[PDB]
Amino acid sequence: VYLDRKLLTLEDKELGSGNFGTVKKGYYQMKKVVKTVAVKILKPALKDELLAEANVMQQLDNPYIVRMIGICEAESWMLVMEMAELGPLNKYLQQNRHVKDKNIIELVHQVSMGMKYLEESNFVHRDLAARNVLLVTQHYAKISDFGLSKALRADENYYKAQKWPVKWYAPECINYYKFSSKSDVWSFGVLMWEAFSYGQKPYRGMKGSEVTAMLEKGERMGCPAGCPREMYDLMNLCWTYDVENRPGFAAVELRLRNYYYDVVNEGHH
């Protein structure tokens, strides 16, 4: 969990940025191999947020979720993770607009498998967006960015909160401050839309309070160009207003798994 600063070699160039500080590429001398890493580097609230985040990732063991190597206290606090070379999903789709439809279904299914696992593990993500999906290859996606994440209490199906990615948030989060796995299902809907719109921001040119107004009227973002109908049906299903009747990730992953098998069969035919 605690890494040795001497074994860590940072690079100058910064790969990305957030409120916390920077993301830089580096190397960590493992037992015999050198391993390529991404490091979150801070610029007291922020400090504690990094320790909590690291404590969450430590518990997570799945092929579709970013792996934490460990943490380090030097110049600043550093959270060290295995590296996803091709970067955040949204940027990638913005710069590769001819990625095939089958490839997108593949990647969002992988996110769904990682989210099904996370549900079973009783953690909520609370920031599930395409910028927080990281690509190892063009056919391998992983979920990261767990700074808003919560381990649910053994006696609760949701976490009660006390600045938010509003456009990814379910009605019950905005209205009642309650975040559950069904809430992440809602954001997955928005994530899919983002993926099929090739990295475009959702609800463009609308303020947070207008989006709320829109959803309450029963309005939803339209089908992206070239997006298969059944994938849009799945999006709308994820956007079930009422938590009770919204599907969980088991249902969502099953549906994505099966649709992907038809599309793979189609290709061969």
Ligand SMILES: Cc1cccc(Nc2nc(N[C@@H]3CCCC[C@@H]3N)ncc2C(N)=O)c1
């Ligand atoms: C090429 C490139 C560019 C930017 C970031 C990355 N890698 C990562 N970024 C984030 N977080 C970022 C934070 C800033 C916005 C984008 C991301 N959400 N977390 C984990 C990783 C990781 N394990 O590799 C890679």
